[PDB]
């Protein structure tokens with residue numbers, strides 16, 4: 703029907719911005735600590751600690767299937783990447799300290815990304 707593609711149209715301009723955001727957010731992780739999912743072969747107890755694992759590659763797959771219907775859904779999965787790391791890893795570790803820096807530098811990008819989604823509609 704006409705509305706539906708206008709809606710799918712709207713969804714189709716929500717993902718690329720979110721992608722540009724996902725490109726920019728991942729540029730603040732040059733070490734690639736949060737690129738892939740945490741391995742349950744290398745970390746066998748990881749699902750005792752973390753109930754909802756997330757990473758950039760998993761977000762990318764969901765993005766590629768137009769899974770994010772709004773900026774909030776994208777922001778929840780980006781917060782999971784940070785929040786899971788900072789629980790599992792201790793305060794004196796390169797992992798925790800990479801998640802802190804990604805949050806601080808990522809908040810600059812998500813600020814303007816909200817402004818664009820609201821303005822463009």
Ligand code: NA
Pocket residue numbers: 788789790791792
């Ligand atoms: Na902890």
